Amino acid sequence: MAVTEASLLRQCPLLLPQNRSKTVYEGFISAQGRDFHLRIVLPEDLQLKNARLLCSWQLRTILSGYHRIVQQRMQHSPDLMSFMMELKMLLEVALKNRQELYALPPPPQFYSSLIEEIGTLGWDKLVYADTCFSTIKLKAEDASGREHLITLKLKAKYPAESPDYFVDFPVPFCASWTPQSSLISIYSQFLAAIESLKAFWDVMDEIDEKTWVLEPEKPPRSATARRIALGNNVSINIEVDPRHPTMLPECFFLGADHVVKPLGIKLSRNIHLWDPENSVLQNLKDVLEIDFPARAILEKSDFTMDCGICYAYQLDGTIPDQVCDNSQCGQPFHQICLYEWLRGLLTSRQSFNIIFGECPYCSKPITLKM
Amino acid sequence: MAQDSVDLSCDYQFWMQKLSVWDQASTLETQQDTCLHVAQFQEFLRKMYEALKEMDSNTVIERFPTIGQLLAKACWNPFILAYDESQKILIWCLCCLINKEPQNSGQSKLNSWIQGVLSHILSALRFDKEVALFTQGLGYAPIDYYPGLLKNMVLSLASELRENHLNGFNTQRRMAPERVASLSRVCVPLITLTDVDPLVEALLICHGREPQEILQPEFFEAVNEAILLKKISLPMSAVVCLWLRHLPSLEKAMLHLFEKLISSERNCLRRIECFIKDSSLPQAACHPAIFRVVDEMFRCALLETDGALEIIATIQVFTQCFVEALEKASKQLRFALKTYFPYTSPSLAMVLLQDPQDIPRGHWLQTLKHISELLREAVEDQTHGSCGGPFESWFLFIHFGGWAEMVAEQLLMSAAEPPTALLWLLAFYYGPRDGRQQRAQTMVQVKAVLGHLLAMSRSSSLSAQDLQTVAGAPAQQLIRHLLLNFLLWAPGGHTIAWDVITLMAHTAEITHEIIGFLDQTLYRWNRLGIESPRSEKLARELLKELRTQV
Ligand SMILES: [Zn+2]
Ligand SMILES: [Zn+2]
């Protein structure tokens, strides 16, 4: 209702006014099926500019951080009713964020059904389960003999709503979930999607075997790009379409302007000779009319010696000179890029011509002297 | 000799009651309001100038009632007196009201008042006190330090903005966002003042971390307008960031390209190429966000007309500029072509990107014959994992000039036994979304027409009526254009071109269309470096004379 005579009853039922002059309320306040203790005190008059509000330690740890907002709302809010509406909203938010600490599943259905279902799959499948039992991860095989993992994240009510499925492979995976469905169902759909993309996989497997793939180093299964190296200090990057892998790829050239140009010309002349019945390599070799090196250098690949902020060599005469003091990063930078970055971060502090801060990549102490 | 007073006597009262509301813009709301209306005020003063110039002072009393109050109110408002020409005109109006030989005291008082207000404009010390005091001692007049002070004032401000940008999420000294908006409003009336340009470029590059827009859209529009008339000359990074923070400004800029291809410079592709390269759109369109929105305005125009040849050519020019700038300035880590052209198979684009400068003139046939095959697959065999439809694969193919126009000329070069796949490509060009029955009927008509044309070419120089027989619909523009390509190609041309052109140019639309066609063709030839000087001179003369009919 509008007035605070029946609306306050209806919208905060478990707040009971103690005093006849309705000034002290005490009781509980509700949020996502959970009641929090709360005790409020007004002045002699109905002004919230000054009021007491005490809570249980349950409620304060959950309204941790938002303390200043609530304190502000005490002073800014006109009526008590609206202040409570706002505090229930606010409370909902603070709970929905830290949903990790605050939950309880319905065991009689849940834990047993999930273990029945993992038995229905087969214990050869399951590879990981989280202590909250929320995330689990299963495995499958290709006919080619490739492992593909699938992460599910489960809610408090597993069979009721959909579980969030996360998978590596590059086409979007679609799983028809029903309330009747279960882990065997989505797993069968996953095996179907695996067998669909077999051809893309074959392509990328053949490439990563018989060629020096360069910068998807140890590439994922999501990865469509393969910067292949050829000759010396020149590369061709190659993006492949999953639905049509054997089809012509997107390819272009990085390196020396004088070496690449005749290659682009030869490509232009031979592109009509592309054929999606052979292999990608077996087509590219006769299209660009050259052979590849099979790992010409395995040790000293092109360790990226670029700014790791601007990703360029040769920024305004400057060289990547400022580096990381770390064995695992060793990442060069520029003065200018790394100065504009460190002057940003909140952690950084500046002496006379020195700034100490965190390396962007590894977050270790790095020093810059202008 | 119609109004001479009425519209102006209304505007007078409007402006005078508005100046009274405004004066001196010492607040927020007077400022925003002045910056809006000022442009019209300028025109009003030009008309007022014309009115007072033609007549004389001190004799006539038409609007002499309140001209004084108007010019005063104007002068003490500095957002008026700093706009493009307002001050110069305001001087003029007071110069007209002066009198050489005052008789009544009113004329002398007026002249004195005029000297007073002029002196206020030019030479009044409304500045800080101690700085005024310091200079007189050193023997400096206002003029010979005003410039440095401004310059040194501007640089200061620019640094502060520069520093506010780097202090993103830092415990110090946040430049109060009120002052940034204030500066943005103050730069607007004086954007054509060269001395401030340093401030603009800093305001646009120093976006800040505030999630709301701290600058107000009166500012973006002024900069945007002024980039396009070439009255400010910023650097490219500034305009790219203006485009990327204010999409309605990129619409108003890409519309200013469509007026360039519709009104002013119809079918002069050299002036369009010059405009596009000089404008920054190609450089700015390396950003995928701006190419998806610039491409969406081209599509809207491609649909409003049902495939106007004038739009197509502009798109071809744009795409050629864009390509060598995507290429030019992204060495490592560039965006993948399915990100600019996200609907088609990337394969197809990767083919159509290959410039025909790079290919021998003889191997163009093979490349086209291959493209045709892959396009036929993409349209007719419309299965999952392909285009959205025929229109999309079309709209791609349209972006790449060179390929689309060489088709007819290669059919003529291989006129004996034309390849059906090329016939398919050509028929597809002039109409997609037809269905095989239509495309087949069109193709067989075209093949018969090609049979007629090879016979006619290997014959002597014949009439134009023999051509109107086979010409004699939904498939007219294809046959028209093929016949024009025949005229330019065959050496039987340059004798009987006029005879066909006059008959074909029924309306003005077909004439304009043919002009456009010929311009596109000469641009294309001169670009690809493919030329037969017969056709060059022929087309130039025809274009010259057809530009007269309009
Ligand atoms: Zn750098
Ligand atoms: Zn590091």
UniProtKB/Swiss-Prot annotation, chain A:
Pfam family, one: FANCL_C
Xref: SMART domains: FANCL_C
Top-rank lineage group of the source organism: Eukaryota
Mod. after translation: The RING-type zinc finger domain is monoubiquitinated in the presence of UBE2T and UBE2W.
Phenotype when changing residue 248 to A: Impairs interaction with FANCI and FANCD2
Gene Ontology molecular function, alphabetical: ubiquitin protein ligase activity; ubiquitin protein ligase binding; ubiquitin-protein transferase activity; zinc ion binding
Spans annotated as UBC-RWD region (URD): 104-294
EC number: 2.3.2.27
GO biological process: DNA damage response; DNA repair; gamete generation; interstrand cross-link repair; protein monoubiquitination; regulation of cell population proliferation
Effect of residue 149 to A: No effect on interaction with FANCI and FANCD2
Modified residues (N-acetylalanine): 2
Binding site for Zn(2+) 2: 324, 329, 359, 362
Listed result of changing residue 310 to A: Abolishes ubiquitin ligase activity
Keyword Protein biosynthesis: no
Pathway where it operates: Protein modification; protein ubiquitination
GO CC list: chromatin; cytosol; Fanconi anaemia nuclear complex; intracellular membrane-bounded organelle; nuclear body; nuclear envelope; nucleoplasm; nucleus
Keywords attached to this entry: Acetylation, Cytoplasm, DNA damage, DNA repair, Fanconi anemia, Metal-binding, Nucleus, Transferase, Ubl conjugation, Ubl conjugation pathway, Zinc, Zinc-finger
Domain notes for this protein: The UBC-RWD region (URD) region mediates interaction with FANCI and FANCD2.
Protein's UniProt name: E3 ubiquitin-protein ligase FANCL
Curated annotation (Swiss-Prot), chain B:
A Pfam family it matches: Fanconi_C
Annotated localization: Nucleus; Cytoplasm
Effect of residue 521 to A: No effect on protective function from mitomycin C-genotoxicity
Expressed in which tissues: Ubiquitous.
Principal location: nucleus
Keywords: Cytoplasm, Disease variant, DNA damage, DNA repair, Fanconi anemia, Nucleus
GO cellular component terms attached to this protein's record: chromatin; cytoplasm; cytosol; Fanconi anaemia nuclear complex; nucleoplasm; nucleus
InterPro entries: FANCC
Result for mutant: residue 64 to A: No loss of protection from cross-linking agent-induced toxicity. No effect on IFNG-induced STAT1-binding
Disease: Fanconi anemia complementation group C: A disorder affecting all bone marrow elements and resulting in anemia, leukopenia and thrombopenia. It is associated with cardiac, renal and limb malformations, dermal pigmentary changes, and a predisposition to the development of malignancies. At the cellular level it is associated with hypersensitivity to DNA-damaging agents, chromosomal instability (increased chromosome breakage) and defective DNA repair.
Job description of the protein: DNA repair protein that may operate in a postreplication repair or a cell cycle checkpoint function. May be implicated in interstrand DNA cross-link repair and in the maintenance of normal chromosome stability. Upon IFNG induction, may facilitate STAT1 activation by recruiting STAT1 to IFNGR1.
Subunit and interaction comment: Belongs to the multisubunit FA complex composed of FANCA, FANCB, FANCC, FANCE, FANCF, FANCG, FANCL/PHF9 and FANCM. This complex may also include HSP70. The complex is not found in FA patients. Interacts with ZBTB32. Upon IFNG induction, interacts with STAT1. Interacts with CDK1. Interacts with EIF2AK2; interaction between FA variants and EIF2AK2 may lead to augmented EIF2AK2 activation and cell death.
This protein's name: Fanconi anemia group C protein
Gene for this chain: FANCC
